[PDB]
């Protein structure tokens, strides 16, 4: 009351301020360095501190965003770092933080993180433990300013833990890099997660991720009643929208309450909660927040029933349209958990509509009775698209089902940069190792959302330079429909031949120097220069000129000795694909 910050202080800490002051600035102000950040987040703590000893201190009773941004600009004061930002904060609230947020690089023009040996990381671990924490938190919110704060929190406190475990023992090497190198590829998946949640909401506004939390909290939590379900709802949009506008104190103390309320009411929601709810606070949110789906009632009636069958229904829609059609996601949703998420919302939205023009339309009951008929393709085509892929997957392996994958989008959209075609087809073809080994039944919810997450990272890395026009249009036109608008497009008849570049296939030595992950990114751009080469020429019997690739790479890798062979070799090679007119 009548502090806000003092409240927060009150609520998270003094431990967990801290660090989620330090998360707020370093997502921000991404090129700066660390010893700015500290001293601005002691800055901020003692003024908290300060407001919490006496109420009517200076003044203090302001609004979280406005010591934000008075402690943002107003102190660094700087210009070249980032430009157009000395006019950003000339505005007053709410302006000044959606001008911040527009600022924020997605994929930042920073050095990549490298991990030193174990022993000095260890040595500086126990000569400055509560620093080094800190630093850990810095990398990782300036590279992924998007980052789900609360999420952060658990992560430092995974990464002290694993510390604290290994190299005050035997065997230092051989303990730590299994555990980190778990939680790097953890923190790339619960970034680019939020980021898919966190675009929803700037992009399409508050109704889509509310009918997506309906979607997903009625397939985790059946036999529950739709109050619940919408109260659940209506608190994790809340929590989700202040993440999203830099609200890390707030979004954080927010996420606290709804897990301290779904274990309290915990008989009425669900009865896989009992181990979820017996963990720390920072590893309660995150157990709830990954539960396990709950087993469906028993016997459930037909939805046929008071949905197309009643003479009521478009007078219900007409009473009012957004608790009507969350109903239908409701229980359309608790009795098929074999569907994606975004396949529940193209359904609702078929069935939305129907309705619209049948009410509206001489006799009601002539065109809603059989809309669950018009369901049936929808269900199908995503069926049969991760039925084929996944047996294609399991007759090439990983590395060749990238290349057929990269081979495919390279055709459809030969306009997007080389390295975003190349970084999107790996992604891509990572969920054949993900979960084409899962049954049939939980094939689907984990294919889609996951093809979702990376149409989503390809969106985001198109936008700030927009050179394909069909990437724009299934982008921006539809969150749910984006998945089917990619696996829709043919070939693309325009785009010329990018013409031959004499530069792009000279591979000289090197190759057979260092780990093979990053070799193969030096054959999959080469595959995308040829592709874009010839994309009209691109039959699957002219593309066996990989064998001949793998052929000199191999000679030459066994014969690194005398590194003119490279060139020979590769020179060669060229001048023979190139008579082959492949
Ligand atoms: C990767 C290590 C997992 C440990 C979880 C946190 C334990 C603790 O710090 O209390
Ligand atoms: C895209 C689905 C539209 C109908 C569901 C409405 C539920 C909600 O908005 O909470
Ligand atoms: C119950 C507390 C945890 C819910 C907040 C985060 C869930 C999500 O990532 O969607
Ligand atoms: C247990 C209350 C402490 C608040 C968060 C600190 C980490 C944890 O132990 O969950
Ligand atoms: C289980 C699906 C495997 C990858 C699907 C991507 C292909 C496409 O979008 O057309």
Known sequence: HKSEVAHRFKDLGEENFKALVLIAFAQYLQQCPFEDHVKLVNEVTEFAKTCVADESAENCDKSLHTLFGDKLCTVATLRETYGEMADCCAKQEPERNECFLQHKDDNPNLPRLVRPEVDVMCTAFHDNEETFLKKYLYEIARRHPYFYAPELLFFAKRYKAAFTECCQAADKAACLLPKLDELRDEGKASSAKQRLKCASLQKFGERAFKAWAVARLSQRFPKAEFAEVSKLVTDLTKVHTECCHGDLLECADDRADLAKYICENQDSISSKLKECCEKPLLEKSHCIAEVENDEMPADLPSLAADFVESKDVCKNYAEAKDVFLGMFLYEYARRHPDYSVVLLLRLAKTYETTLEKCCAAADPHECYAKVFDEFKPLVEEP????????????????????????????????????????????????????????????????????????????????????????????????????????????????????????????????????????????????????VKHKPKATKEQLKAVMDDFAAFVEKCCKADDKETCFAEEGKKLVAASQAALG
């Open 383 to 530: 069926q049969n698209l991760i039925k084929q892929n996944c047996e294609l997957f399991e007759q090439l392996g990983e590395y060749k089902f990238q290349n057929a994958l990269l081979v495919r989008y390279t055709k459809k959209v030969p306009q997007v940069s080389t390295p975003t075609l190349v970084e999107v087809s790996r992604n891509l073809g990572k969920v054949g190792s993900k979960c084409c080994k899962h049954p049939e039944a939980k094939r689907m919810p984990c294919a889609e959302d996951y093809l979702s997450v990376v149409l989503n990272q390809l969106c985001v890395l198109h936008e700030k330079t927009p050179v394909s026009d069909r990437v724009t249009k299934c982008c921006t036109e539809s969150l749910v429909n984006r998945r089917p608008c990619f696996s829709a497009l043919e070939v693309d008849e325009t785009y010329v031949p990018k013409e031959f570049n004499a530069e792009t296939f000279t591979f000289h030595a090197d190759i057979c120097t260092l780990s093979e992950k990053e070799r193969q990114i030096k054959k999959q751009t080469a595959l995308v220069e040829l």
